[PDB]
Amino acid sequence: GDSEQKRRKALKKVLDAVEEHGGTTILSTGITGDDARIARAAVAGGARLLEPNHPAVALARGHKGVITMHAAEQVRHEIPLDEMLKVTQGVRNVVGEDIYITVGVPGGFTEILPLELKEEDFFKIAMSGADGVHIHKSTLEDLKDVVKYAHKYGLLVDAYIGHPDDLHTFGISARTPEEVAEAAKEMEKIGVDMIGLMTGMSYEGTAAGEIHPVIKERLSALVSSVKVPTLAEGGINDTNYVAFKDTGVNILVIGTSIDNVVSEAATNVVKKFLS
């Protein structure tokens, strides 16, 4: 069908990028996800997968004066779905059909206020040009509902595993490496198209250039448990990128580190013009 051919083309984009980049590619997010100028710039640097999302758009629009990612996360559900549809379509307009776009929308994460996505909304997301939805729901039953509607409208789902003690949940809870593997396998059976692990916790005593052994072991459990493409999201920067890649995970979700470099470039050029 039409949904079917669409999803097959979309997965090929992801598989091609993984291959092109030697087994690990990047899901470029933050400002590269929502601003059409910077999305194009990211693609010019080799990015093949982009992720516009609602907290980043809150930051871009100065929603409620938020100036940190953390503050933006707390108001992300206030960004209307229509705004994400406009952003997604705008980015698609400029990067063309070969780039992969997965969108974070209000109601697509575990929100702090219960926004329910309706079937209608998945149709709208597909009509806006997204290839997928970036999902941080925190129960398997919620993921089943998301997968059903996403697949109906020709969208792929990338969804995540987190830790039960996370202050703000960003996925299916897994306390131990064994539970990470079990959660990944269940998510694969449900039909989640790409499965990731939240890896952003900062540990005391992490050796320079390395990832903390707790995270590495959790990632290993994900990487070796499923056949679908795997992701790591959170805490990835240029000092530990290779350490993340060494785990064999297929996609590194990178936003903050890129935001920081782009922001600093702007600060420095203004500083130069003024001096």
Add this chain to the structure above:
Amino acid sequence: NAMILGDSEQKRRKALKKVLDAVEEHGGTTILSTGITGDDARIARAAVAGGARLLEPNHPAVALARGHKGVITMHAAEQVRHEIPLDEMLKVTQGVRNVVGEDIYITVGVPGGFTEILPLELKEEDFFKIAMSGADGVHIHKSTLEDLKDVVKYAHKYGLLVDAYIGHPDDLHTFGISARTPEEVAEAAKEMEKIGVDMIGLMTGAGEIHPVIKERLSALVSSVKVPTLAEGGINDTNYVAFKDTGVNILVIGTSIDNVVSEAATNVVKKFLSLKK
């Protein structure tokens, strides 16, 4: 203007003080930071952290930010800029205002504020909306003194400052009051100043400025008492030469946009090339 004479006057006085404070803070010449630094709140904050005190969100830049009709150059964006709803510029202005606070100066380019290719003018209510969205000023590229008169009337009523521009009759696209000779630049500037235009700019698009441009800028600089601007073609190779004319404000967009884009390209390239 019934009941809001003092309200508007105070607002305009505080806004101009932001500009004059920036000019002195920066040694006699400051910048009006535009392009992505004008419309994206993350990058506006980054610009302010680098020392920027004046920002300019504008509709062609927002068209590019939104990928409107797939435009990927500012040239193409200028051609569809009138399709960006005023409401979107109001949202952008308020959003940047939210993050930079009350001390930063913001002047906004809006549909109908430039010389649009379709009949499109700002109504009185539009200036009210612009003031309500947190703008200090409107960034105006109108082609007749008559048009500026109506803009100044409504802008000032609602406590907004006007920065408006002088162009050349030979310009491919109209961005201001036509002035052929440096003497006419000075004449135009004086007339605009009399009309009430608050800041007056000249379109200026090796490390030297073209002699013709330099003569026009010098004419502008010595013709009026209000803050003066130069807009167009300002980059790292010639910005000192622009400063040396004594013009108060350099409007810089493209050069900053390019550096910011290149930074994004390079950081992505860097990640993809990291080796053990």
